[PDB]
Design a protein around this ligand. Structure first.
Ligand SMILES: [Ca+2]
Length: 547
């Protein structure tokens, strides 16, 4: 008689995507004279997006409309049932692989082992990258925090130096931002009776690139003091003003920790002596701020060895841990150490081999903080950015995030948080996901209960919808590009050379995923044969590689 099915889709309510899905659900009733009814459910309605696989398998849901490569961790073959970086990159080629070169049956055998019936692929779109900052070349991906959908997509970007996270499309921007600063933030941790920290944030270079720096610090109170548990410190340090040659500088900072004699207002005095590539100097300074509001400013003056022949930025973090706001349930190691105070030792490592060792002593005399600093920097290349003053302060952390194509990403508000779009060159507009396929998968028991006449009709329905969906998305994307311009969003194109650099990374990662199990091996072997047959892949790009 009448069959009812609940199917949840990866599309959020109020997307172009979701509207196309409900339309399909009405088409299925038409194509079956009301014998099969599909109740559509937006993302999250019944279970979370990434929980759909287990919900369908167990029958909580009858079926799902996911992005197929979300199952890459638990079914390697599914990394090969949607585009991967710099492989087959036209919708028609994936249609051919699926419907004549054996892809569909490969997919069906793999899913049936899980108690799922893979109906067929649904054509969708290519994907864009929405970024807060201008990523203008391959090297700019290093240090970026990037949301991506895992599997081979994430592996390729991790090999290009990105930190990757997996989040559902609907939930990228409350969080990815927090995550990026969590990265750039110092990481406090108790060890061996000291409070230690590690900071992993790049300098900003005038050419837009970044220059990596690893900061390791040991802080030790001069009297025994309660150590805290591990925690995090958001610190933002600005250079407020400077003279021409930086012999007089004003900086200020706000610092906050998260999971009687130190008065509300405190002044400090600092003296630094140091050497960088053999250039000796001294600095004297005076500062003030609000230790519990954690806002401080200071004025520094080069008293010897001025002008300094290197970037001020390597000294700025050396000039005040008493001025960090700590919540009540995090012991304040720095404040509790007073009046005797504390010492620290630091070893900053850069990416060109430059090294700085720093020693600091912090005490309290007469109601004023006294800081003494000794700094030794060596091994900076003479032409490098530190010695040639080509740096601009410290990165606050960089967020970029793939999700889908331009319309639906606009539905989800990406234009508000990110003012750049990163695409490939016109030859290769999508480097990571040119053909981002969805599918329909039905609980296997549900499927086999359906009369074979309705089975065939549902398969036909899905094949028709694959291209209606595709066509609908593509139309919306045409409307979206003008809205991006109105929002102030700038489209950046990478170069052919940038593509070559991704390609060297991508091909070996293909073969590693291919060799995970028998299904992944079978599917990649047939994709590779096709790619070789149409001149996608040369024999030479392949040298040293074999299933
Ligand atoms: Ca994507």
């Amino acid at each position: 008689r009448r069959y009812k099915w609940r199917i949840q889709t990866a599309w959020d309510a109020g997307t172009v995507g979701y509207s196309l899905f409900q339309k399909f659900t009405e088409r299925v009733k038409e194509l079956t004279d009301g014998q099969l009814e599909v109740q559509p459910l937006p993302a999250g309605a019944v279970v979370g997006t990434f929980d759909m696989f287990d919900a369908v398998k167990t029958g909580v849901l009858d079926g799902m409309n996911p992005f197929t490569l979300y199952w890459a961790e638990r079914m390697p073959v599914t990394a090969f049932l949607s585009s991967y970086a710099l492989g087959l990159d036209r919708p028609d080629q994936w249609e051919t692989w699926f419907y004549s070169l054996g892809g569909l049956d490969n997919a069906r055998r793999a899913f049936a082992e899980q108690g799922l019936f893979y109906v067929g692929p649904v054509q969708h779109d290519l994907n864009t990258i929405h970024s807060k900052k201008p990523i203008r070349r391959f090297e700019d991906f290093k240090g970026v925090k990037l949301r991506v959908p895992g599997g081979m997509i994430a592996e390729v970007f991790a090999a290009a130096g990105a930190s990757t996270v997996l989040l559902p499309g609907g939930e990228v921007y409350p969080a990815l931002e927090r995550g990026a600063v969590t990265a750039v933030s110092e990481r406090m941790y108790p060890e061996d009776g000291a409070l230690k920290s590690e900071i992993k944030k790049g300098l900003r270079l005038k050419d837009g690139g970044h220059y990596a720096a690893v900061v390791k610090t040991t802080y030790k109170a001069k009297k025994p003091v309660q150590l805290p548990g591990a925690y995090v410190v958001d610190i933002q340090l600005d250079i407020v003003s400077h003279n021409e040659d930086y012999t007089i500088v004003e900086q200020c900072e706000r610092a906050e920790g998260r999971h009687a004699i130190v008065k509300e207002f405190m002044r400090f005095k600092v003296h630094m002596e140091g050497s960088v590539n053999g250039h000796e100097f001294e600095i004297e300074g005076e500062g003030e701020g609000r230790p519990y509001e954690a806002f401080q400013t200071a004025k520094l003056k080069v008293t010897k060895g001025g002008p300094l022949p290197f970037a001020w930025d390597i000294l700025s973090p050396q000039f005040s841990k008493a001025y960090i706001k700590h919540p009540a349930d995090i012991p304040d190691y720095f404040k509790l150490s007073f009046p005797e105070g504390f010492r620290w030792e630091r070893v900053m490592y850069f990416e060109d081999g430059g090294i700085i060792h720093v020693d600091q002593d912090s005490s309290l005399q007469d109601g004023v903080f006294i800081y003494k600093v000794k700094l030794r920097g060596t091994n900076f290349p003479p032409d490098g950015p530190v010695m040639q003053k080509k740096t601009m302060g410290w990165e606050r952390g960089r967020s970029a995030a793939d999700f889908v194509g331009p319309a639906v990403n606009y539905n989800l508000g990406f234009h508000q948080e990110a003012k750049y779009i990163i695409m490939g060159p016109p030859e290769t507009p999508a480097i990571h996901q040119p053909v981002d396929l969805m599918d329909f998968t039905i609980n296997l028991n549900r499927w086999r209960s359906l009369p074979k006449p309705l089975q065939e009709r549902f398969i036909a329905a899905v094949h028709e919808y694959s291209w209606i969906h595709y066509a609908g998305i593509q139309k919306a994307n045409l409307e979206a590009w003008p809205k991006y311009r109105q929002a102030g969003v700038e489209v950046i194109r990478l170069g052919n050379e940038d593509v070559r650099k991704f390609r060297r990374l991508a091909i070996p990662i293909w073969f590693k995923w291919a060799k995970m199990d028998k299904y992944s091996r079978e599917a990649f072997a047939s994709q590779l044969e096709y790619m070789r047959g149409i001149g996608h892949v040369t024999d030479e790009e392949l040298k040293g590689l074999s299933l």
